[PDB]
Amino acid sequence: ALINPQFPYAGPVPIPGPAPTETMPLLNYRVEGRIAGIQQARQFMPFLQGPHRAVAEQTYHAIGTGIQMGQTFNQPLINTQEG
Amino acid sequence: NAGTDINYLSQRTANFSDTRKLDPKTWAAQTRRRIATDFPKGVYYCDNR
């Protein structure tokens, strides 16, 4: 702010002001609020809580069976070298 | 009518104090900033969101 003498800035907005209204009042709000609809315990989703496999491992079962059977052919006898 | 039957529009509070006393075209200008065009003839909008 600058004040300049001799033209000085009025020393106030004075008493000639026009009170325009008495509408100043905010009427307090008084209220009762009830949000009470029956609630049912459940919601349907496509899927909740699953941690789906991105790849599975290979998996398997097992079997064996049979017996011990055989047809054989042997090497001929040979002269013994030494000993 | 497209504003020609109105001197001005405004929103005023209890002291006679207008916060936006505007001629119709200027009022329409504010609306053009909101919906990119004008509402139909005789329809005036005011945003206080």
Please tell me whether residue B27 adopts helix, strand or coil conformation.
helix
DSSP B35: H
Task: Determine the residue type at A15.
Answer: I
CA-wise closest residue to A20 among B2, B14, B21, B36: B14
**Strand (E) positions, chain B?**
12-13, 17-18
Q: What does this entry list as its resolution, in Å? A: 4.2
On whether any CB of chain A is under 8 Å from the CB of B1, the answer is: no
| Angle of CA points A72, A75, A76, to nearest 5° | 125
Q: Is the Cβ pair A23, B15 closer than 8 Å?
A: yes
Inter-chain touch B16–A20, beta carbons under 8 Å: yes
The technique is: X-ray
